[PDB]
């Protein structure tokens, strides 16, 4: 997730840490919520989500330190905020903020066309204003890792996670294949891949850059506008290679006006030089997010 994609590591005492409960699970670890003390200065008291490390083996210790620095290194408003690790003692743990409102994809399937509201969100289906601050969110955080040259490879709205106020930030725990399967394609005896978010040259050539995002994006934004739906949900999994690797495009959600399925199609052209970039997407989004509810209304 990491490693291959492109100590100044702050630790944490395991005294400070008090685990409170299991949120998921995985094959290689565990997330808890957790009360961390003395962590913030304004906040005594506060809540994070806690990754243990499943196997401390030597492999599993150096991928652990990697991920760490890494993450340490990738911070930004909308990419998931990571405090630090915990080393003395097994397990190993890693601790970042919690988000109140789990995976984006579990958020927009309960707030679809058959929706409660709430505290942060109004009763109903998500509103085109809200739907397009999500993907202006999202897109943000693109821009950030766009910008140091990182490149994501599993681009998806199960991959970023929503906190109170609908903060929406770029981030998993690493447990995706786990929790969501029917995502990916197992090609290997281990090797599972997201190739309804991936571009035909993903696919067909197995390249993967910042072009092989922004059309991961694409079809990030094809889902909030879906409210979660799977991409190609009507396809098996080699039906779906054929229509990527053809060049068929995903058909324009109900929800979607016509000029944010515009913004989609320029993340999908074939040509990964020809696809528009992250920043422009975003400025896009960022726009249509901000634009007052007249111009909104009879867009
Ligand atoms: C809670 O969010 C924190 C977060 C913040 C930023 C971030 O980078 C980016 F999105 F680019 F900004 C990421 C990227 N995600 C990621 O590395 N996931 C991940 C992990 C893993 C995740 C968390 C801790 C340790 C390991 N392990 C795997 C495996 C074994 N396989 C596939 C992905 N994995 C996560």
Redesign the pocket.
């Known amino acids: 997730?990491?490693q291959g994609?492109i100590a100044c590591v702050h630790h944490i005492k395991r005294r400070d840490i008090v685990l409170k409960w299991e949120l998921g699970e995985g094959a290689?670890?565990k997330v808890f919520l957790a009360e961390c003390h003395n962590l913030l200065p304004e906040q005594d008291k506060m809540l994070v989500?806690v990754?243990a490390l499943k196997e401390a083996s030597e492999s599993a210790r150096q991928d652990?330190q990697r991920?760490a620095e890494?993450?340490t290194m990738?911070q930004h408003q909308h990419?998931?905020r990571?405090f630090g690790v915990c080393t003395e003692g097994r397990p190993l743990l890693?601790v970042?903020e919690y988000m109140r409102h789990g995976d984006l994809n579990r958020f927009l399937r309960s707030h679809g066309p058959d929706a409660a509201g709430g505290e942060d969100v109004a009763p109903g289906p998500l509103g085109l204003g809200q739907l397009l601050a999500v993907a202006s969110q999202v897109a943000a955080?693109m821009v950030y890792?766009a910008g140091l040259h990182?490149v994501?490879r599993?681009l998806a709205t199960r991959?970023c996670?929503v906190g109170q106020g609908l903060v929406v930030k770029?981030?998993?725990?690493?447990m995706?294949?786990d929790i969501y399967s029917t995502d990916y394609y197992r090609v290997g005896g281990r090797t599972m891949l997201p190739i309804r978010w991936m571009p035909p040259e993903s696919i067909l050539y197995r390249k993967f850059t910042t072009e092989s995002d922004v059309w991961s994006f694409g079809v990030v934004l094809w889902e909030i506008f879906t409210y979660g739906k799977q991409p190609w949900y009507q396809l098996s999994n080699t039906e779906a290679i054929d229509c990527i690797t053809q060049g068929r495009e995903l058909e324009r959600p109900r929800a979607c006006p016509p000029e944010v399925y515009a913004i989609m199609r320029g993340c999908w052209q074939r040509e990964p030089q020809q696809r528009h970039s992250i920043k422009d997407v975003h400025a896009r989004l960022q726009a249509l997010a901000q634009a007052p509810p007249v111009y909104l209304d009879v867009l």
């Open positions: 997730g990491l994609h290689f670890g989500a990754k652990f991920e890494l993450l990738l990419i998931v990571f890693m970042f955080g890792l990182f994501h599993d991959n996670l770029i981030g998993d725990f690493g995706s294949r």
